[PDB]
Amino acid sequence: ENPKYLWWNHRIIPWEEATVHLTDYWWASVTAVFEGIRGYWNNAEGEMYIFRLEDHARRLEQSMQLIRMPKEFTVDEICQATIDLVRANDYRGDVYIMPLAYAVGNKAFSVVGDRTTEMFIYSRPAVSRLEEDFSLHACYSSWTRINERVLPPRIKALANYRNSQLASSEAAMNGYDTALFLNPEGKVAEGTGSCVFFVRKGKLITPDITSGILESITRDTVIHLAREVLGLEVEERVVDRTETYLADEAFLCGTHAEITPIASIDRHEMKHGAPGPITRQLRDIYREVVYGRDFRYRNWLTPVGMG
Amino acid sequence: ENPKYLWWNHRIIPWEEATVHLTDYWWASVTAVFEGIRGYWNNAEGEMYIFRLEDHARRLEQSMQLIRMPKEFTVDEICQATIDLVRANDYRGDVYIMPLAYAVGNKAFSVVGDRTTEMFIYSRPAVSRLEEDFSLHACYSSWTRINERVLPPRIKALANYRNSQLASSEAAMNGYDTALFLNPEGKVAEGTGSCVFFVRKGKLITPDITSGILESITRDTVIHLAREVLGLEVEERVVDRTETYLADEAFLCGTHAEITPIASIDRHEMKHGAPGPITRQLRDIYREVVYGRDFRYRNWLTPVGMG
Amino acid sequence: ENPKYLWWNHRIIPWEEATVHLTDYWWASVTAVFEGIRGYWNNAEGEMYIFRLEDHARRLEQSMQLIRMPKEFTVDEICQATIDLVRANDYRGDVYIMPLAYAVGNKAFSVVGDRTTEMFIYSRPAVSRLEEDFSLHACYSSWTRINERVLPPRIKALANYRNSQLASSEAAMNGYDTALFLNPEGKVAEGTGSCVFFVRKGKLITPDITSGILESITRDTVIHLAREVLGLEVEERVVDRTETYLADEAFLCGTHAEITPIASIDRHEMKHGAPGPITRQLRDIYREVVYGRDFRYRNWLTPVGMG
Amino acid sequence: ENPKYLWWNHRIIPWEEATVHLTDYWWASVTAVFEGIRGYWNNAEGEMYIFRLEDHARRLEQSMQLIRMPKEFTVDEICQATIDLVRANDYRGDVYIMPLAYAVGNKAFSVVGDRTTEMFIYSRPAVSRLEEDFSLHACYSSWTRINERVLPPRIKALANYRNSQLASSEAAMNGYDTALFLNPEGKVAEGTGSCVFFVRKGKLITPDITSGILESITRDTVIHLAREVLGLEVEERVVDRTETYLADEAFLCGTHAEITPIASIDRHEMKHGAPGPITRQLRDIYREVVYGRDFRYRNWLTPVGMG
Amino acid sequence: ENPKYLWWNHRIIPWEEATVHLTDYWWASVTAVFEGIRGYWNNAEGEMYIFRLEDHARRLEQSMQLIRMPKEFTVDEICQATIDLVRANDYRGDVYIMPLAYAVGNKAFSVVGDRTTEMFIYSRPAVSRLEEDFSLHACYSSWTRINERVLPPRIKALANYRNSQLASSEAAMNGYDTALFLNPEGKVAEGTGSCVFFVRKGKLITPDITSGILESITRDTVIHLAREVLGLEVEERVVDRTETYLADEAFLCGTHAEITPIASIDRHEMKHGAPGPITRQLRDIYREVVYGRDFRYRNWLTPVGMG
Amino acid sequence: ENPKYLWWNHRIIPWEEATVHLTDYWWASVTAVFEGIRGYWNNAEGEMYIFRLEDHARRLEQSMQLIRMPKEFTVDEICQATIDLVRANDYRGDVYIMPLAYAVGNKAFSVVGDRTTEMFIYSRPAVSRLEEDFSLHACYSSWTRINERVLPPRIKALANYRNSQLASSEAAMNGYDTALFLNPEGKVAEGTGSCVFFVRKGKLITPDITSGILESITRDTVIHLAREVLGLEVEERVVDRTETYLADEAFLCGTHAEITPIASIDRHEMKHGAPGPITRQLRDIYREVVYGRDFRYRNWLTPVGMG
Numbered sequence A, B, C, D, E, F: 001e002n003p004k005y006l007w008w009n010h011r012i013i014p015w016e017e018a019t020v021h022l023t024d025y026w027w028a029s030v031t032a033v034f035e036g037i038r039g040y041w042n043n044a045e046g047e048m049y050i051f052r053l054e055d056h057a058r059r060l061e062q063s064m065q066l067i068r069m070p071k072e073f074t075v076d077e078i079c080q081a082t083i084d085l086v087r088a089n090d091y092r093g094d095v096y097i098m099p100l101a102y103a104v105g106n107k108a109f110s111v112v113g114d115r116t117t118e119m120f121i122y123s124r125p126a127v128s129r130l131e132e133d134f135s136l137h138a139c140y141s142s143w144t145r146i147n148e149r150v151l152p153p154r155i156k157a158l159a160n161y162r163n164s165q166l167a168s169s170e171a172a173m174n175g176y177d178t179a180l181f182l183n184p185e186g187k188v189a190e191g192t193g194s195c196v197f198f199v200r201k202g203k204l205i206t207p208d209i210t211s212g213i214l215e216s217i218t219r220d221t222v223i224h225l226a227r228e229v230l231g232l233e234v235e236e237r238v239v240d241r242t243e244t245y246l247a248d249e250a251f252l253c254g255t256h257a258e259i260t261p262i263a264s265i266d267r268h269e270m271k272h273g274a275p276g277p278i279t280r281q282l283r284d285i286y287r288e289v290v291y292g293r294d295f296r297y298r299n300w301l302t303p304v305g306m307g
């Protein structure tokens, strides 16, 4: 049913001890920021590898700074709590870990810095699809992405996802698997829960960070692997809607989404299939990295030996 | 400490029975919509008057429709639950009532229509300031209001308030009481938790609804009272920033905020004071209406006799 | 197969005489403007009624002025040619008439005033659906309406319809009957080939002309009939996307489209059905006007007696 | 008068056989896309060189995909038809070739994918000005360029040219030779029928493709020649209006326009003349390439031996 | 050569006494705001009539408040100084009066409230053209009007006129008499030194104040006279570019410009001439008002008897 | 009190001879453009070093060209006049020099090319803070930066500073030292009188020139020194608001401002202090360059030997 433990406000506690009142956190949720972190289980080594844990912890501390949450937790404490929780839950398999920080008050929605900062970390089993060949059909949404003027997409805020839900609900009702956003200027931004890459003429293209997107750690990883392992040109730039319709390949990338091939965009089929040849290479390389089977990228992994 | 009861998913329950898990509602909160409703206690009559309850219930049903929450609760059930909760709590004094609806799943942030719709209603004591002469100093925020392109302000969504908090935190750190927003086109919108009115040359001016604001019930009330009781001209129109600096009077209006006079905007003082003469008249008329002391507007009140 | 005649460059000619070269008009088409005009056949009177012919002729002369076509044809000549063509074709039934004006040169796409102005008028049988109860399911498009900055929608230019086709192709591939547009500011504009009306709380709402729409003659007609015959309030104003989801009724209006009820918008159902009660009244009144069965509006009709 | 032949729907036919009805293609023209291709005659070799034919054919297939025209013609068939038509016309001199594809139906303007795809190719004599020293006086237009939100400029659609004509008519009435566009954000885009380059401090500057321009093949050619033959720095970037007023040199480039020097922009004279020194070098190099007198760039030429 | 006197910092002084250093006011000019006021000489009465002096004085006090100039001068003092200067100059003829207020410091361009407020008033002969039938040819500028986001056009600031000069220089170099502006949204704003009115179908149309214009006193005057004397409908609303091309009449209005008919806009001729029939009526009525020959509007005039 | 001399219209004159009338230059100021130039006194060498004089003179000639001032002064004459004035004033200490050019007429605000071009140069003592460790607290303004659509920020126009003053007055009233601007798209632009740099992860970031900023000579200098002396990566790119809150260091740069460290931005503290380590290095290197103590950059200095 539930994991054995969670982490909450500087301590590991049994799951059933984290009882609260229905009314306690609705106002707090408007302040909340979070991370998505994966642990990949290597049965041959008896080790969980938590992927880019310090980078995720640093981004959570940045998000919390941008919300104006008083300082309460450090990067090293978030890292250590994650390791301690994954070991104590004693689940030997792939996991998805969600640290979530919030400021509690004003049970009252419309100032953050007068509130107290709290955090929990919740680790649950989650399967990987990196051994599976699958693809999604995407649409561009009629709803525009949040931007720096109103709700900065650099901040990984729960509230941002209300805009994600406009797009993801439209995609589902209109017969698509997933939605991509345009920014207010009409340029390509990101997906509802991932960044997007395009392959054309043997090069990788992705919206630059100032297109109004999350600074995706899976995006950064893919840029490094594409340049370093495959020797590909990668362009971080402004990207137009119609050029993406002509892509040879496309894929989403994100911690939960891993590397998710895109078969079509607004019913324009990616010419080289899904996963196409370069996407297949990147998904296979990414898989060997996160499972601790590529020594070149060991510095990205935090091992948790579970004996 | 706490009210005796709350209402949750079609039943009144004792407060202490509404226990839940820490992890239960974070994803749900991204779907959530809510109302703010006041009950005003008339000790002479032994009656609570809930103000424009059906209008609030109808707006909540509209918000829930716009989020795409499956149909579960009706307008008549929301009204009746509110009456039943205010009576059962047996608190003979002014209250603030928050119905909050949410869709629960995907404990997973980035489709609503596959989720189940839930709701609670929480009524707590809240004082009125309508017998008090006070005023606030406002600033226009450096942060822009959400708009129809990204997060429609007609929908009373919890997530909208992340944008309110950008502005309200800036106002507090910059030495102001409260913030006003501009919309993306640079026109005046609303406050962080209220609509705004301006008085100039004996007429009332307020941003039109398509300026990108909540369709405030207190705004509608004030328009009716200004025209019907005081015989004033009221203009619902596009409003510019600099014209508001020259206002004779200004005020916020909202269910929680009631009628809150504004003394200055970006350190431009309202010429006729705060509350100025017309604001004083409207605050006094509004007070006599909501306490059940003006028979002309009885159709706005839901009485709860508490014997 | 084909009508007996058409009108071309100041004369009626037999259909088969209007032969031209494949290469003759591609460049000309970028300059072209047109009208849609209906003739309604009244078998009891032996008369075709051409609806608001002078208004259509005047708009065509305005469009041609805005394209900068040299003066060649007058309003009275367009009216007379239409009457002469409908009589000479000797088709006793409902028709749709398309005058189309173009400037020919530079067989060369990227100045109009150095070109010669030409025009034809093509009248063909077209059925009316005004005795039929039917409705369409609409979506708002991901593609934005043309605006005054780039391609003024007041000008009834053929080229405008490339933007209509972006939206109408998306609607069809996404399982809708018809598309509605937002303008660049995110406000409701028009349909791909019609204006749109909304009914809420017993009043009619339609985007104002400066929302970036054609100055629809069917729109003007409906405003007059709603105010004069039904006594309804009609608001020409800025209209938001989400308010239209809450409409009691909605309908398209246009010369070809007549009055076309809308059952839903982005899968939000119009509460009072389609045709709803007010839409039904307007469609029935409009039908009695255009068939010459309402003497109050005779001044809108041009009769062509066909003996 | 006319060329001997044209190509239409998979066959070469005598010119006089391509007769059609006046009414046949007006609706089709709203779907239409096209290319401009030059053939350069080398009398010493008895060979026509068609410049970058496969690149033009590929762009036409992309445009047709973006319009959603059913698949009917291939890249290899467009190339072969062009070669076959230039040879069969037996005109030994410079030509301009226009393939034009259209979808025919709905003789009815406001879905493409239900239509049948057709195409013709029209080759006519056209002189080169590459041995001539001439320059144009440009203005920036008061009319804004089409953008991805409304009418993507990557698609070489006939309808786009209605926006070109707003600008080119203004330039002519205001005493200029040619117009340049700003995009909606106010940045430099393209000319009405060409891309634009600027020379300042010995480097070449041109608007990046996401400024909202056609992906000009003459632009690509000029970038290659500037870097490879002249060793110049070339910057593809966002370009401001006022910086272009300070350019040392400027020029248009396009298939029909070739390399067309600009003497002034809004009556600011280019400091180094027109053609200035670098423009002269590029025009001379481009001329030697397209006439088959530079073996380094042979892979750009398709020779048609005409004996 | 020069007037006898000017007014400066609370006193009338002989002209030749207002000597200053070249370097004294360049930084001050960035803070400066001003008014334009006319005096009309009635030789039959021996009286100068200063038109709407208190309204001009009030707008200057508003401009100075918006710049944040410390309070130094009152409305009554500005009025009295104007009267005193026009009498002391002893010029019996039409005048144009410029009060100009500035804040002096930081001889240092990039805080106002730490500066001292100063003002002068300069009255000079200026002829009226209200007995003359003349018209101007206008263009819409390629340069956009200042808006509330960057430089509010309600404030009558000297610096605003740098944007006026972009447009007025373009008009002159492009062979027009005068320029009209579009605002950033592409809607009609104002002229470079006047507001604009359009006449179509017997009604008057003018951009609403929130289109981003000065709140012109001549505009207000014309609205009153059109409604009260002529019984015309006047619409203050958003106005589109292309509708103005179809106007029957058009005119500029402003204190210096008086009522200046517009013959054409971007070489579209106003159908009913310039001055057209309604413009002629308004110019004649305005003339009889400002010369003290219409008792209905005496309350607009400040008489200065000069014996 | 005052310097001995100034330069005006091709000649050096004693200060007291530059007397003018109060009314002479208000209209002229709307046309005016200027430069800020520093002279740094090296007592050991007996030499003033004027920093990048030719670059400043060239930018002034560009500004004057963009205003459309008739040609009157050359770059070499501006350079020589500056040298001649600094020597003749015989002030042996640090100076700030302001050339200011204006066009005089139409004493009449709303065409430049019909006016006569004039210029003065004013040199005054000004201290350097380059031996001082100090920092400023910045805010982002609620007022937007001027852009190419309305008032190009490349032109160093006096009128631009009205927009600077909106921001600098807000910063002062809101308890900050200095203001930073966003451009209309919401991206980081410049300060009110300087460009801005950010340091993060050991690299330098600054808004690209097309973000809507002055082409700062101190910015160019800092880019050269950072790359050439320190070997740092420098990124000229679009910059977001929230990324700047996370900067390790930040600083303003400009001729008057020199290198001015920023301690915080909207009350987000720069992690590595102010001046932080890289800022300290750049300020020290810049100081040794401008005082003639670094032979590598001698070509930037104009020496004036004062014996």
Ligand SMILES: Cc1ncc(COP(=O)(O)O)c(CN)c1O
Residues within 6 Å of the ligand: A036, A190, A191, A192, A193, A194, A195, A213, A214, A215, A216, A217, A218, A219, A253, A254, A255, A256, B110
């Ligand atoms: C909106 C959005 N964008 C991008 C991503 C991908 O980010 P990361 O690779 O760091 O998981 C996510 C998932 N966190 C997301 O929710």
Ligand SMILES: Cc1ncc(COP(=O)(O)O)c(CN)c1O
Residues within 6 Å of the ligand: A110, B036, B190, B191, B192, B193, B194, B195, B213, B214, B215, B216, B217, B218, B219, B253, B254, B255, B256
């Ligand atoms: C953003 C916002 N705007 C306006 C209002 C005022 O709305 P009402 O008068 O219906 O309470 C509120 C309070 N609900 C609000 O939060």
Ligand SMILES: Cc1ncc(COP(=O)(O)O)c(CN)c1O
Residues within 6 Å of the ligand: C036, C190, C191, C192, C193, C194, C195, C213, C214, C215, C216, C217, C218, C219, C253, C254, C255, C256, D110
């Ligand atoms: C885009 C558009 N808008 C509106 C309309 C309706 O115009 P009318 O009622 O004049 O036919 C049409 C049909 N002409 C249209 O094509």
Ligand SMILES: Cc1ncc(COP(=O)(O)O)c(CN)c1O
Residues within 6 Å of the ligand: C110, D036, D190, D191, D192, D193, D194, D195, D213, D214, D215, D216, D217, D218, D219, D253, D254, D255, D256
């Ligand atoms: C709008 C536009 N832009 C650019 C170009 C230049 O494109 P190319 O060099 O591929 O001819 C053209 C001519 N096809 C054009 O019409």
Ligand SMILES: Cc1ncc(COP(=O)(O)O)c(CN)c1O
Residues within 6 Å of the ligand: E036, E190, E191, E192, E193, E194, E195, E213, E214, E215, E216, E217, E218, E219, E253, E254, E255, E256, F110
């Ligand atoms: C920009 C602008 N707009 C409008 C006007 C007209 O204003 P008024 O009628 O008050 O003179 C003027 C002249 N003051 C002006 O300069």
Ligand SMILES: Cc1ncc(COP(=O)(O)O)c(CN)c1O
Residues within 6 Å of the ligand: E110, F036, F190, F191, F192, F193, F194, F195, F213, F214, F215, F216, F217, F218, F219, F253, F254, F255, F256
């Ligand atoms: C607005 C603005 N921006 C930037 C700068 C810095 O420019 P520079 O380094 O050339 O002095 C200045 C000072 N001239 C300025 O006023």
Ligand SMILES: [Cl-]
Residues within 6 Å of the ligand: A002, A003, A004, A089, A091, A123, A124, A125
């Ligand atoms: Cl578990």
Ligand SMILES: [Cl-]
Residues within 6 Å of the ligand: A223, A224, A227
């Ligand atoms: Cl990398």
Ligand SMILES: [Cl-]
Residues within 6 Å of the ligand: A227, A232, A233, A234, A235
């Ligand atoms: Cl790379």
Ligand SMILES: [Cl-]
Residues within 6 Å of the ligand: A035, A036, A037, A254, A255, A256, A257
């Ligand atoms: Cl994730």
Ligand SMILES: [Cl-]
Residues within 6 Å of the ligand: A264, A267, A268, A269
């Ligand atoms: Cl597909």
Ligand SMILES: [Cl-]
Residues within 6 Å of the ligand: B002, B003, B004, B089, B091, B123, B124, B125
């Ligand atoms: Cl209680």
Ligand SMILES: [Cl-]
Residues within 6 Å of the ligand: B223, B224, B227
């Ligand atoms: Cl009312």
Ligand SMILES: [Cl-]
Residues within 6 Å of the ligand: B227, B232, B233, B234, B235
């Ligand atoms: Cl009213």
Ligand SMILES: [Cl-]
Residues within 6 Å of the ligand: B035, B036, B037, B254, B255, B256, B257
């Ligand atoms: Cl509330």
Ligand SMILES: [Cl-]
Residues within 6 Å of the ligand: B264, B267, B268, B269
């Ligand atoms: Cl104040």
